[PDB]
Amino acid sequence: LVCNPWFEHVSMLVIMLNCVTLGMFRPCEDVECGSERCNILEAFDAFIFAFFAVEMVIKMVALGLDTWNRLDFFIVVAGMMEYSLDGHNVSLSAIRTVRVLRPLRAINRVPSMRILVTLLLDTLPMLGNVLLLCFFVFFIFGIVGVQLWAGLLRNRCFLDSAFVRNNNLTFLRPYYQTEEGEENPFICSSRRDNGMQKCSHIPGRRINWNQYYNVCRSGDSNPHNGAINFDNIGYAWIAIFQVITLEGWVDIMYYVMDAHSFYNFIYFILLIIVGSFFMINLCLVVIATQFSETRIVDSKYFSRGIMMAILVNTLSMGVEYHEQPEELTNALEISNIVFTSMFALEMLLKLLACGPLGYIRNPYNIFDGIIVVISVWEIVGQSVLRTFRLLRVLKLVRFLPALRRQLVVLVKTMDNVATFCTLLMLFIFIFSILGMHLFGCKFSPDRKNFDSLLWAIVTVFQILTQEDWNVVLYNGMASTSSWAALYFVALMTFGNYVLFNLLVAILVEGFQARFRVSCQKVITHKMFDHVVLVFIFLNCVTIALERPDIDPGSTERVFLSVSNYIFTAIFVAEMMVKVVALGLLSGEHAYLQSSWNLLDGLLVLVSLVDIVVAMAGAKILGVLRVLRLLRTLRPLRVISRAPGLKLVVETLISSLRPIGNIVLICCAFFIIFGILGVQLFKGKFYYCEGPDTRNISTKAQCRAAHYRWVRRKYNFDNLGQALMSLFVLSSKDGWVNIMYDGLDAVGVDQQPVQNHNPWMLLYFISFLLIVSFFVLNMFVGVVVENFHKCRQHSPTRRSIHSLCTSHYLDLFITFIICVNVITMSMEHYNQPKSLDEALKYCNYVFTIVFVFEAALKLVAFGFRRFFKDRWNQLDLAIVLLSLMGITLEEIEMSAALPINPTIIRIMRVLRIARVLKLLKMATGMRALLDTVVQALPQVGNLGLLFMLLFFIYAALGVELFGRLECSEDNPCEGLSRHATFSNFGMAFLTLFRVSTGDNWNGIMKDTLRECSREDKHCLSYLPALSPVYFVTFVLVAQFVLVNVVVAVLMKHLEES
Ligand SMILES: CCCCCCCCCCCCCCC(=O)OC[C@H](COP(=O)(O)OCCN)OC(=O)CCCCCCCCCCCCCC
Ligand SMILES: CC(C)CCC[C@@H](C)[C@H]1CC[C@H]2[C@@H]3CC=C4C[C@@H](OC(=O)CCC(=O)O)CC[C@]4(C)[C@H]3CC[C@]12C
Ligand SMILES: CC(C)CCC[C@@H](C)[C@H]1CC[C@H]2[C@@H]3CC=C4C[C@@H](OC(=O)CCC(=O)O)CC[C@]4(C)[C@H]3CC[C@]12C
Ligand SMILES: CC(C)CCC[C@@H](C)[C@H]1CC[C@H]2[C@@H]3CC=C4C[C@@H](OC(=O)CCC(=O)O)CC[C@]4(C)[C@H]3CC[C@]12C
Ligand SMILES: CC(C)CCC[C@@H](C)[C@H]1CC[C@H]2[C@@H]3CC=C4C[C@@H](OC(=O)CCC(=O)O)CC[C@]4(C)[C@H]3CC[C@]12C
Ligand SMILES: CC(C)(C)CCN1C[C@@H]2[C@@H](CNC(=O)c3cc(Cl)cc(Cl)c3)[C@@H]2C1
Ligand SMILES: [Ca+2]
C-alpha cells in the first residue's frame, strides 16, 4: 500500500488531476452552480477529496502520529471543514478559497523540487536581519508621511457657500473636477500651506464659471477611489510600498508637491535610495551569500565565402518596411532564390566529398540539410515558411568558436534552471487561481482582469514584472476591500525578493563552482592638477546656468558669453604648455600617447572651431546647433583630474570584457526578433483617434467620420522602429501597451480589435523571458569575474551602578520604546479629541522615564565617563530634544502664541528619533549595515560617476528638449508641470525619474511627436536623437547601479 513506490506515482497522478479541475473554474459562471458542467466538476472535486481523505487515514494508521506531512494534514482538515460545513450559506463561498493550497502537495512528490524548497526554507531564517531593516524604513517613513500629509489629498477647489447661497444657483458641481471626473483630481493647496498648485491656476472656461472655484477645503475622497493617501499608518504603508517598487512613485510625489510643498522631493529621493536601492538589494546579497554557504571544401576561403553568404542574406532580410516598393519586393525574392541555391550547391558538394554517411556524421551538417529542404520547398510550393527563414542565422554557429563556447555555457545553464522554473510555474499557478477567487468578474471589462485562467496567469506575470501593478491594485482595493493589498504585497514579496533572488544564487554558485624645462616643472607640480580642477568646476557652473529662457539682451547672456572665451583660453594654454613639455606625438612619452590626453585634445579642438563659427552673418545655423551639443561633454575632463574617478572608470570598462560575448548574443537576438516583428506587425499599428469610434472599422470610415488616422509611437514599421520597441519591451517599462497593440492588430488600413489574436502573447512574453535570462547572465558574469580578481589579490552609588550595567535596564527601555512605537502609529486624520489628550499624556510618561535613565546613567559612570560612549551621547541629544519639543507645546497651549505652528510640527516629526535606540539592541542588523560601510570607498566613487553622468545628460537634455511644450493642442504623455527639461534644475530631477525607469517611455514619446507647423526653433532631426539619448542613458545608468550591487556583494562574501 504505502511501501510500494508506485503508490506515490498514483498520488502524483491525482495531484495533477486536482490541478486541472482547479484551472477549469470559471469565476462568475460557476458561482450560480446552475449549469451541468459545474455539477459534474463538483462531483469530480468530491471524489478527489475522498482519495486524499482516505490516503491520509492509511498513512496515519501505518505510521501513527515530517513537515510536509503536516501540510498534507492541514489541507485535509481545512477541506473537511468546507465539505462538512455545506448547507450553511454564511460565507460558504469565502470558505471555498482554501482549496488553492492543494497544488502545494506536488512539492513533496517531486524529489528535485523538494530539495530546492528545503534549501530555500533553510535560508529564510537569515533574512530576519533584512526584515528588521524593512520595519525601520517603513515605520520611519510611515509616520513622517502621516504627520505631514494627513488629509491633504482630499483638498479640492470648492464654490463659496455665501456665493452659492446668495445667488440661488445649484446647477454647478460643488467643486472643480475636469471632465474626466474623479479619475484625474485637481488637488489644491490650502491657504496655510505652500503647495505648488493653487485654486488660482484653474483653467478658464473653454460668463466664466471656472473662476468662481476659489475655496480650497477638504473634500470627501482621496485619489484613486481612496486608495492613495496618508490618512493613517495603514494607508501610508501602501504608498510607501508602491514607491519601493518604483512603479508610479512619481505620481504620489506630484500629489504632495501640489498640496504641501515643492520640497517634498527630498522625502522621496531618500526613500528611493535607502529603501528602494539598498534595502531591496541587500535581500539579493544575503540570499546569494547564504546559498553559497549551504579538399577545397575544407579550405579556409570556402568557409569564409559561405559565411558572408549567410551574413549578407541576413542583412537583406531586414531591409523590408511598410509601403515597400514593388520593385524592392521583387529584388528580395530574387536574392532569396540565389542564396538558397548557393546553400543547395554547398549541400551537394559536401555530400560528394564525404558521402551520404559521412555528411550525417557531422551534427552541424545535419542542421544545414534541414534548412535546404524548406528553402527549396518554399519556392516549389509557390507564407508560414517565410518566417522560418530567420533560422539561417543559426548556421553561423559553426564558424564562431567564442560564441559557440558561450552558447554551450548558457545551454548548460538550463539544467540548473529547469528545477527553479518548475517551482516558479507552481507559484504563478497558485496565485492565478487565488486571484480568480478574490477578483472574479469584479473588475467591471478591464483587460487586466482575473475572469479566466489565461488572463489570470497573464495578469500575475505582469504584476511580477512590476508594470502597471498599481493599476491592478487600485481595482482590487476598490472592488473588494482595502485589505486586498495583502494579495499584491505577498505576490510581489515572495516572488521578486525571494524567488528571483534564489535564481540568481543558483546561477552565481554554478559558475563560481630652456623654456621647455620650465614647463616640465610646472605640470609636474603637485598642485597643478588641483589648480586646473578648480577651473573645470567653475566651467560646470557656467554650463548649468544655461537655459532657453535667457534674454539675449540681459546681463546674464553677456556674462555667460564672456566666461566661455576665458575658459577656452585657459584650457588652450594648459594644452599648449603640456604639448611643449612632452611633444605632440613624436616622443615615446608624447602628449597624445594616452587616451585621457587625447580626450582633452578633441575638446579643445571643438572649442576653437566654435570660436571660428561664432566669428562668422552666414548660413551656419545648423553647424552652430551641433557644436552646442558637443559643448556639453566638457565635464568629462573631471575624470582624468581625480585619481579615484579615473580608477573606477577603468574598472567598469574592464568588467565589460568577460560578458562581451553575451552582449553580442543579446544584440543578435534583438535583430532576429526585430525582423520577425516587422514581418508580423508592419502596417498594422494604426488606429482611428476620436471621441466615439465604435462604428469605425477601416481608414476610409475614419476619414468619413472626420476623425484622425494616426500611428503608434512604438511600432514595427521597419527594423529601426522595431528595435526601439523591443528595447522598451526589454526595459519592462510600457511593455504591456506594446503587447496590446500586437494582440489587437488586424491588418493594413484596418481598425484594431481588442484581443483579436491572443496567440501573439508568445511573441512578447517569449522575448521578455529570454532577454531577462541574458541580462541575468551579464550580472552573474560581472560577479564571477570580480570574485576572481578579489581572490588573486559609595554604597548608595554601587547599587545604581549594578542596575545600569545589568541588562535589565536596557530591556526595560526596549519595551517602553516599543510601546511608544505603537502609540506613534495611533495618530490619524480627524482623530477624536479624546485621543489627542490620551496620546499627549503618554508622551509625559516617556519623557520622564528617559530622563530618569539619563540621571541614573550619569551617577553610575560619571560625567566624563558617561559622555565617552557614543550611544550615551545619542540618548542625551534626544532627551534634550524631547524636552524642547514638549516645552514649546505647553507654550502653544498657553495664552502667548509667538511660536509658529511650523516649528511645532517639525518638533513633532523629529520626535521619531527615539526609534534609533532599538538600533543598539539589534546586533544582527548593525552588522549588516557595517557591510555597506566597509564598501563605501568603492561605492563612493561609483556615486561620483553617477552624478557626473547626470550632469552631462542633464545639460544635454536642456539643449535638446528645453523648448518642448505641453498644451491641449499638443498634449504630452510623459512630460508635465513637474517633469520638464526647461532648466538644469528640472532636467536633473527628471533624469532621476528616468534612472528609476518610471514612465520613462512616456517621456520619450513626448520627444518623438512632431512639432506644430506654426512653432519655430524646432529641431528637424530630434526624433532621431531622442532614442540615442534615452537608450544610452538607461544602459549606462543601470550598469553603474549594478556595479554598486556587486561592490556590496563582494564585501559581504569576504567578511564571512
Ligand atoms: C511594516 C509593514 C511592511 C509591509 C507593508 C506593506 C503594505 C501593507 C498594506 C496592508 C494594509 C491594508 C489596510 C489599509 C487600511 O487602513 O485600510 C483598511 C481600512 C479601510 O478599508 P475598508 O474597506 O474597511 O473601508 C472602510 C471605510 N470606512 O482602514 C481602516 O479603516 C483601518 C484599518 C487598520 C489600519 C492599519 C493598521 C495595521 C497596519 C497595516 C496592516 C498591514 C500589516 C503588514 C504586514
Ligand atoms: C541592422 C542589420 C542587422 C540589418 C540592416 C538593417 C537596415 C537594412 C535597416 C536599418 C535602418 C533601416 C531604415 C530606417 C528608416 C527608413 C526610412 C523609411 O522611410 C523613408 O525612406 C522616408 C521617405 C520620405 O521621407 O520621403 C524607409 C525605410 C528605411 C530607409 C529603413 C530601411 C532599412 C534600414 C536601412
Ligand atoms: C555643481 C553644478 C551642478 C552647479 C550647481 C547647480 C546650480 C548651477 C543650479 C542649481 C539650482 C539652479 C537654479 C534653480 C532655479 C532657477 C530658476 C529658473 O528661472 C527661470 O527659469 C525663470 C523664472 C522666471 O522668469 O520667473 C531657472 C534658473 C535657476 C536660477 C537655476 C539656475 C541653476 C542653478 C543655480
Ligand atoms: C502597529 C499598529 C499599526 C497597530 C495598532 C494601531 C491601530 C490601533 C490604529 C492604526 C490606524 C488606526 C485607524 C486609522 C483611521 C481610522 C478611520 C476612522 O474613521 C473611519 O473609520 C472612516 C474611514 C473612511 O471613511 O474611509 C476610524 C478609526 C480608524 C479605523 C483608526 C482605528 C485605529 C487604527 C487601526
Ligand atoms: C540593439 C539594442 C540594444 C538597441 C540599440 C539602440 C536602438 C534602439 C537605436 C539605435 C539607432 C536608433 C535609430 C536611429 C534613427 C532612427 C530614425 C528615426 O526617423 C527619422 O529620423 C525620421 C525623422 C527625421 O527625419 O528626423 C526613427 C527612429 C530610428 C529608426 C532609431 C530607432 C532606435 C535605434 C535603432
Ligand atoms: C539586474 C538584477 C540585479 C539581476 C536584478 C533584476 N531583477 C530585479 C527585478 C525583477 C522584476 N521581476 C521579474 O523580472 C520577474 C519575472 C517572472 Cl516571470 C518571475 C519573477 Cl519571480 C520575477 C527583475 C530583474
Ligand atoms: Ca512603469
CA atoms within 13 A on the CB side of 962: 18
**The three grid cell numbers given for residue 478, joined into one nine-digit string:** 476598490
Residue type at 100 in one-letter notation: V
Tell how far CA 223 is from the center of its chain: 23
Tell how far CA 798 is from the center of its chain: 58
State the distance from the centre of ligand 3 to the C-alpha of 632, rounded, in angstroms: 17
Pairing of strands 686-689, 708-711: antiparallel
**The three grid cell numbers given for residue 762, joined into one nine-digit string:** 508568445
In which element (H, E) is residue 157 found?
Answer: strand 155-159
Mapped to the 3 state alphabet, what secondary structure does 469-508 carry? HHHHHHHHHHHCCHHHHHHHHHHHHHHHHHHHHHHHHHHH
Tell how far CA 721 is from the center of its chain: 23
CA atoms within 13 A on the CB side of 454: 7
Instruction: Give 198-213 as a DSSP string.
Output: -GGGPPPP---SGGGE
Task: Say which CATH topology domain 6-106 has.
Answer: Four Helix Bundle (Hemerythrin (Met), subunit A) (1.20.120)
Pairing of strands 213-218, 155-159: antiparallel
> Is residue 489 lining ligand 1, measured as CB closer than 6 Å?
yes
Cα distance between residue 271 and residue 249, in whole Å: 10
Cα distance between residue 362 and residue 436, in whole Å: 52
CATH 1.10.287.70 segments of the chain: 413-512, 649-793, 924-1056
State the distance from the centre of ligand 3 to the C-alpha of 985, rounded, in angstroms: 6
Q: For residue 1041, count CB atoms less than 10 angstroms from its CB and return exposed for 0-12, middle for 13-18, buried for 19 or more.
A: middle
Task: Say which CATH topology domain 924-1056 has.
Answer: Helix Hairpins (1.10.287)
Cα distance between residue 261 and residue 256, in whole Å: 7
**The three grid cell numbers given for residue 363, joined into one nine-digit string:** 551534427
Sign of CA dihedral 84, 88, 91, 94: positive
In the chain the first and final C-alpha atoms are separated, in Å, by: 49
CA distances from 852 to 802, 839, 856, 858 (A): 16, 21, 6, 10
The SS3 call for residue 155 is strand
State the distance from the centre of ligand 7 to the C-alpha of 998, rounded, in angstroms: 5
Residues with CB under 6 A from ligand 6: 424, 461, 464-466, 495-496, 499-500, 504, 772, 776, 779, 1042, 1045
Residue 247: phi and psi, rounded to 5, are -110, 115
Nearest to 683 by CA among 708, 711, 717: 717
Nearest to 676 by CA among 728, 711, 723: 723
Residues with CB under 6 A from ligand 4: 232-234, 822, 825-826, 828
Tell whether domain 649-793 is in CATH 1.10.287.70. Answer: yes
Testing ligand 2's pocket by substitution, the residue of 321, 328, 675 carrying the most ligand atoms inside 8 A of its CB is 321
Cα distance between residue 663 and residue 777, in whole Å: 10
DSSP 497: I
Residue 710: phi and psi, rounded to 5, are -125, 160
Nearest to 877 by CA among 839, 852, 850, 848: 850
Cα distance between residue 178 and residue 185, in whole Å: 7
Cα distance between residue 501 and residue 25, in whole Å: 32
Instruction: Give 523-565 as a DSSP string.
Output: HHSTTHHHHHHHHHHHHHHHHHT--TT--TTSHHHHHHHHHHH
Residue type at 1014 in one-letter notation: E
Decide if 452 contacts 432 (C-beta within 8 A): no
**The three grid cell numbers given for residue 651, joined into one nine-digit string:** 574598472
State the distance from the centre of ligand 1 to the C-alpha of 224, rounded, in angstroms: 16
Decide if 1041 contacts 1014 (C-beta within 8 A): no
Maximal CA-CA distance, the chain = 109
Nearest to 569 by CA among 535, 544, 537: 535
Decide if 479 contacts 53 (C-beta within 8 A): no
Q: Give domain 796-921's CATH number out of 1.20.120.350, 3.30.565.10, 3.40.50.150, 2.40.30.110.
A: 1.20.120.350
The SS3 call for residue 751 is coil
Decide if 938 contacts 655 (C-beta within 8 A): no
Decide if 584 contacts 995 (C-beta within 8 A): no
CA distances from 924 to 123, 919, 930 (A): 15, 10, 10
> Is residue 1021 lining ligand 5, measured as CB closer than 6 Å?
yes
The H helix count followed by the E strand count for the chain is 45, 4
Testing ligand 3's pocket by substitution, the residue of 545, 550, 950, 988 carrying the most ligand atoms inside 8 A of its CB is 545
Residue keyed to cell 504591456:
736
Nearest to 684 by CA among 721, 724, 731: 721
CA atoms within 13 A on the CB side of 627: 16
Decide if 280 contacts 497 (C-beta within 8 A): yes
Q: For residue 402, count CB atoms less than 10 angstroms from its CB and return exposed for 0-12, middle for 13-18, buried for 19 or more.
A: exposed
**Ligand approaching nearest to the C-alpha of 820:** 4
Q: Which residues contact 300 (CB under 8 A, 6 or more apart)?
A: none
Nearest to 957 by CA among 547, 541, 609: 547
State the distance from the centre of ligand 5 to the C-alpha of 816, rounded, in angstroms: 62
- The atom of ligand 2 lying closest to the CA of 721 is 14
Sign of CA dihedral 597, 602, 607, 608: positive
Cα–Cα–Cα angle for 93, 97, 101, rounded to 5 degrees:
155
Testing ligand 1's pocket by substitution, the residue of 134, 483, 494 carrying the most ligand atoms inside 8 A of its CB is 483
Nearest to 642 by CA among 238, 964, 940, 347: 940
State the distance from the centre of ligand 1 to the C-alpha of 835, rounded, in angstroms: 19
Cα distance between residue 837 and residue 376, in whole Å: 88
**The three grid cell numbers given for residue 1033, joined into one nine-digit string:** 542613458
Decide if 262 contacts 271 (C-beta within 8 A): no
Neighbours of 1013 (CB within 10 A): 6
CA atoms within 13 A on the CB side of 850: 25
Nearest to 686 by CA among 719, 714, 727, 721: 714
Q: For residue 960, count CB atoms less than 10 angstroms from its CB and return exposed for 0-12, middle for 13-18, buried for 19 or more.
A: buried
Decide if 698 contacts 686 (C-beta within 8 A): no
Instruction: Give 316-375 as a DSSP string.
Output: HHTT-BTT--HHHHHHHHHHHHHHHHHHHHHHHHHHHHHHHHHHHHSHHHHHHHHHHHHH
Cα distance between residue 229 and residue 166, in whole Å: 35
> Is residue 241 lining ligand 1, measured as CB closer than 6 Å?
yes
DSSP 502: H
Instruction: Give 30-54 as a DSSP string.
Output: SSS--SHHHHHHHHHHHHHHHHHHH
Q: Whose CA is nearest to atom 4 of ligand 6?
A: 776
Q: Which residues contact 78 (CB under 8 A, 6 or more apart)?
A: 98, 101
Task: Say which CATH topology domain 300-399 has.
Answer: Four Helix Bundle (Hemerythrin (Met), subunit A) (1.20.120)
**Ligand approaching nearest to the C-alpha of 1027:** 5
Cα–Cα–Cα angle for 498, 499, 503, rounded to 5 degrees:
115
Task: Say which CATH topology domain 537-641 has.
Answer: Four Helix Bundle (Hemerythrin (Met), subunit A) (1.20.120)
Nearest to 631 by CA among 646, 647, 614, 645: 614
Instruction: Give 409-457 as a DSSP string.
Output: HHHHHHHHHHHHHHHHHHHHHHHHHHHHHHSTT-----SS--SSHHHHH
Cα distance between residue 583 and residue 376, in whole Å: 64
Nearest to 495 by CA among 518, 463, 469: 463
Cα–Cα–Cα angle for 882, 864, 868, rounded to 5 degrees:
70
Mapped to the 3 state alphabet, what secondary structure does 60-113 carry? HHHHCCCHHHHHHHHHHHHHHHHHHCCCCCCCHHHHCCHHHHHHHHHHHHCHHH
Cα distance between residue 675 and residue 484, in whole Å: 42
CA atoms within 13 A on the CB side of 977: 9
Decide if 78 contacts 98 (C-beta within 8 A): yes
Residues flagged as binding site for Zn(2+): 45, 86, 88
Residue keyed to cell 561664432:
614
**Across the strands, what pairs with 404?**
none
Q: Whose CA is nearest to atom 27 of ligand 3?
A: 983
Q: Whose CA is nearest to atom 8 of ligand 4?
A: 826
- The atom of ligand 4 lying closest to the CA of 226 is 26
Residue type at 603 in one-letter notation: L
Report the CATH number of the 413-512 domain.
1.10.287.70
Cα distance between residue 992 and residue 996, in whole Å: 6
CATH 1.20.120.350 segments of the chain: 6-106, 300-399, 537-641, 796-921
Residue keyed to cell 515572495:
494
Residue keyed to cell 555597506:
932
Q: Whose CA is nearest to atom 2 of ligand 2?
A: 315
Q: Which residues contact 136 (CB under 8 A, 6 or more apart)?
A: 915, 919
Q: Whose CA is nearest to atom 19 of ligand 3?
A: 983
**Ligand approaching nearest to the C-alpha of 471:** 7
Sign of CA dihedral 573, 579, 584, 585: negative
CA distances from 692 to 182, 589, 688, 708, 973 (A): 21, 73, 10, 12, 21
Round the CA-based radius of gyration of the chain to a whole number and report it. 34
Q: Which residues contact 394 (CB under 8 A, 6 or more apart)?
A: 367
Decide if 997 contacts 961 (C-beta within 8 A): no
Instruction: Give 276-293 as a DSSP string.
Output: IIIIHHHHHHHHHHHHHT
Cα–Cα–Cα angle for 745, 720, 1002, rounded to 5 degrees:
70
Cα distance between residue 928 and residue 564, in whole Å: 49
Q: Which residues of 527-563 are buried (b: 16+ CB within 10 A; e: fewer)?
A: ebeeebeeebeebbeebbebbeeeeeeeeeeeeeeee
Residues after which the chain has a gap (C–N > 2.5 Å): 65, 206, 294, 382, 444, 513, 616, 793
**The three grid cell numbers given for residue 324, joined into one nine-digit string:** 515597400
Decide if 764 contacts 742 (C-beta within 8 A): yes
Cα distance between residue 872 and residue 854, in whole Å: 8
Cα distance between residue 754 and residue 450, in whole Å: 17
